[PDB]
Amino acid sequence: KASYPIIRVKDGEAETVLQFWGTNEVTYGMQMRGTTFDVNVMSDLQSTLAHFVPITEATTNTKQILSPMPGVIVAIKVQPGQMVVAGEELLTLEAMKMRNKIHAQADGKVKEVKVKLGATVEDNEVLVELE
Amino acid sequence: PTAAEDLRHKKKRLTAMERVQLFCDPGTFRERDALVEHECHNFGMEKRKVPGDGFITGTGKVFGRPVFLFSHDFTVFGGSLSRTNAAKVVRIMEEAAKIGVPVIGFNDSGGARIHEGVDSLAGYADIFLRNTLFSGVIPQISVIMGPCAGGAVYSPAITDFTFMVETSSYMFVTGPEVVSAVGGKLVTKDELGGPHVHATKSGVSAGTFPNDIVAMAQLRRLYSYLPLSNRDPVPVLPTADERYRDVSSLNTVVPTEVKEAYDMRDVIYPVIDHDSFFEIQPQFAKNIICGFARVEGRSVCIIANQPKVQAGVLDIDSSVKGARMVRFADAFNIPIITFVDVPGFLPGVQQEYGGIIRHGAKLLYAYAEATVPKVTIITRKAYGGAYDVMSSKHLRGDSNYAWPHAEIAVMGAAGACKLLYSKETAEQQAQRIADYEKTFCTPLSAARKGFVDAVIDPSETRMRVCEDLERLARKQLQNPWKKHGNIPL
Amino acid sequence: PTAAEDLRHKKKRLTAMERVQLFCDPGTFRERDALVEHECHNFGMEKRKVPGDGFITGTGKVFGRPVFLFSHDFTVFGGSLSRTNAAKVVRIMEEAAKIGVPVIGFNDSGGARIHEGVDSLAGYADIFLRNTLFSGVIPQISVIMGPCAGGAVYSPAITDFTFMVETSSYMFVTGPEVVSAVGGKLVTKDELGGPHVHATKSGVSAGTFPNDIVAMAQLRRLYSYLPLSNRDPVPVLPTADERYRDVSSLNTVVPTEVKEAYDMRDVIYPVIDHDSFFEIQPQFAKNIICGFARVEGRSVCIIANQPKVQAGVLDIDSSVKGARMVRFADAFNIPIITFVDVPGFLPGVQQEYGGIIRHGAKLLYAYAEATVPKVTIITRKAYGGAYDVMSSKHLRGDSNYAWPHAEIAVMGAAGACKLLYSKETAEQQAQRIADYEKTFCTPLSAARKGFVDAVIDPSETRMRVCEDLERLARKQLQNPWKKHGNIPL
Ligand SMILES: O=CCCCC[C@@H]1SC[C@@H]2NC(=O)N[C@@H]21
Ligand SMILES: O=CCCCC[C@@H]1SC[C@@H]2NC(=O)N[C@@H]21
């Protein structure tokens, strides 16, 4: 069914079930045996032209993380100078009656000095420094 | 045979003809004019005539529906315009004005052609006038694949949507040489007018793509949404999705605490059909979301706040973004669906020093002037003038709905308690703010006054939206006679 | 009998009724509604009913021509709006929509009335919708005599012109208490939204007056210019001045050096009739002048650059100012006269970081969309896209004129010489820049192409303008059918 997950396919006797995650019209996100892949489905022109396309490399920066917006820090989660893993919440600012929660996108460890509780300073300061 | 394009591809770049071939259907492009020369006769230009004269204009066909397009050529004279280049574009736009067909242009010009004198200015003026006259008649989309400098930048600006390519494109009015000459600062071309700058800082570019191939692939998808002309109806496509699909996950999206945040996409995605959202300006003014989507196989317009970013507070940039989206959607008879969650306007001196009064009025003007069917859903809160601006029932709204835990009040409980009791006995906070929030920060009063049609379970939103949007298919409303409005610029 | 107004005058302030009496004719005001109560029945408001309910609405008559007006009252409840106050204003605006009459309002409200709940929001929404619908049908003028805070600020914004009183008026969206609460900065009310701030920084206020008496006296003079409605013709008044008055002082205004500055008012004043200029926004974006004036007894619109300030360079603020003026002038069929002297656009990073591309397109859109008769005079220079924007002949201009020492070129001589000779032998400056400026920085080439009708002596400008404006009295031009445009916001 269009835009749905389950996809039942049966060649001869063999039967398989795959899943359809999403796409950007050149790359298809399909699941095979409980694993995500990205298959490219392109015609003759797109195939012959995709060779002549720049492939830039994104910035790989392991450095201090700053608070996007002003606020107040009410709760902290991580400890100064210990291990940090991707997807871990680090602290929570509260602004105009709203608690956000900036986390650690991706890294192994940190070296820094924690901003103490109730420090209504923010203004894009260095709350946690990753080194 | 791959002649004369090896020099181009060696620089990791594509050609105009290749871009045109990628955009349209496999074999449905008919180039209109191909043997035209510049006839300049100045500054040693009497030689080196070119057959195509740096432009490729044709008709093409996308998804079985007609289109018109033109593409600049960087190899020939740097893509400069002339008295002769602009004639082809003018002819294409005039033909696409007679017939109800849109126009899409891939800009690559390096600037004006100096060897023609003021004829380049003449051509620019003609193109500007055609864009001005035909805006609101046929949709216009522009993509910038390479450099775009000088006064040629203005014609993409008048167009409805402008997209940018990441690595090898930029746009600005004046070059960095003049900036160094007058101010004395050394800034590179990318640092001045790169795609990121216009994606985040200036708000001109409506999107950014990583490659030309992806740009074409998604431009086709965007084109699948648009109506063909001003008088043609909104397209409807077949779809296996149905209004009876169960959405009970909406009962739990809103947290029971009033100070916790949530993602509005968790409310947007269930209501619309699967994998049918095309966000517009995703990296600019993130506190508001705008884009296109389909509901039961017909394209609609989506405008919702987001408490994830800055508590979902209206601002200057958000106001401009929403105003432009609403104006375009209404110009071509596209239904509008809005989700409301706003505590007010962003407070700060910089805001008044930047003219919040002008900018915030644009969204209100766009919402009030609109005559397309509107549907509004109030999830959690709506305070002060923000409630009025975000498509309130009094602005000729068709149907308005609220969720059982909503709040519609003049302002927060603290300010109301302060103003209602000047020098009342101390500790008044505890036994007054709670009571006022209990009694008047609830949708019961607004429902008593008649400002919301009904209070609904969050699981019935898809059913209600499909029913209302099906019933409202044939509304005919007209404004008083005017030559045109006077919007607060 | 001077009862109950002694308390008001003691604070060096006037009353609403006194302001109304000062505005209209001596005995031609007929108050419409005077015995109306709030019928609230909440928070101990069942008592202290007021007969007028804080508003004075009537009809009046100015210079023998009808008008409609309303005035807030600060003594009664602080001027707060309600479900009942807004009804009178809605009735007045609806009546002034049926009949071709304008509306003028003197705002003094302290904010919304909390004791009514969401009914104040309902009234605000109704007033906003009426302003949105009737903008471009009848002219709307607003004057702010006292405090104006909260969401009530938006209705003056949609109105065509907003004026301010110096000592005792201010306007902003959010009070300084909230600013202190969130940001922590202590700013006074005047430092936040005083008349100077909106006169110079935000660009919202169209003027400032020293006293209420002077405000009324000059508001009458402004009203003498406007047409009564959308369909009524431009007013023409008797005048002893004649087109045959000698103006030979224009031969010497332009200095013979290209780097010396002059005042454009020395060119503006001789052409128009004596003592008939009403500048709009005099203290904001001084590099451009906009206002109203009379030519042979009929009101026209004036838009001219000024090389006195910043070399007469177009900018963001100037673009917004000119765009709003042109849009208003065209909406009501008022002729436009422009004087051109521009070297280009202002170069700087802040400009691109602030969106020059969006703002500079607004003036071009306003000039191209307009259908009223246009007259353009190029005094000294016009370069690049600035020449295109400032009402060039290709944008359906009626008549264009130039002065004998004008210059119309693609860009300055230095840049052209640089681009036309990449690595040409050194010292090329002396024998190339002079030659290029001599050969192509002159109106002869632009006249050969046909972009200026004729090259005239500066002493004939009044004669030519009067002749053309008399002949063009009955032009009928129409744009293609649209629900409305899509201007770059
Ligand atoms: O209570 C003090 C600060 C409350 C601010 C509440 C939000 S912040 C922005 C917006 N403006 C308001 O007046 N309220 C909201
Ligand atoms: O020659 C170097 C600086 C020339 C600037 C000339 C004026 S300044 C602003 C405007 N932008 C231009 O490109 N030219 C004018």
Author numbering:
A (entry chain V): 535 to 665
B (entry chain C), C (entry chain H): 34 to 522
Article excerpt on this structure:
With D3 symmetry, we obtained a map of the LtPCC α6β6 dodecamer at 3.2 Å resolution. As a dodecamer, PCC contains two layers of α-subunits sandwiching a β-homohexamer. Each layer of α-subunits contains three monomeric α-subunits, while the six β-subunits in the β-homohexamer are arranged into a two-layered cylinder. Accordingly, we observed a clear density for biotin next to Lysine 631 of the AMKM motif in the β-subunit active site. There is weak density connecting lysine and biotin, suggesting that some LtPCC assemblies are covalently biotinylated. CoA was not observed at its β-subunit binding site. No interactions exist among LtPCC α-subunits. There are seven hydrogen bonds between α- and β-subunits. Taken together, hydrophobic interactions and hydrogen bonds contribute to the α-β binding site to stabilize the α-subunits onto the β-homohexamer. We found that most endogenous LtPCCs exist as α6β6, and in descending frequency, LtPCC also exhibit oligomeric isoforms with the oligomeric formulae α5β6, α4β6, α3β6, α2β6, α1β6, and α0β6.
One such multienzyme is propionyl-CoA carboxylase (PCC), which catalyzes the carboxylation of propionyl-CoA to form methylmalonyl-CoA, a precursor to the citric acid cycle intermediate succinyl-CoA. Propionyl-CoA carboxylase (PCC) is a multienzyme complex consisting of up to six α-subunits and six β-subunits. The α-subunit of LtPCC contains three domains: a biotin carboxylase (BC) domain, BC-CT mediating (BT) domain, and biotin carboxyl carrier protein (BCCP) domain. The β-subunit is composed of the structurally homologous N-carboxyltransferase (N-CT) and C-carboxyltransferase (C-CT) domains.
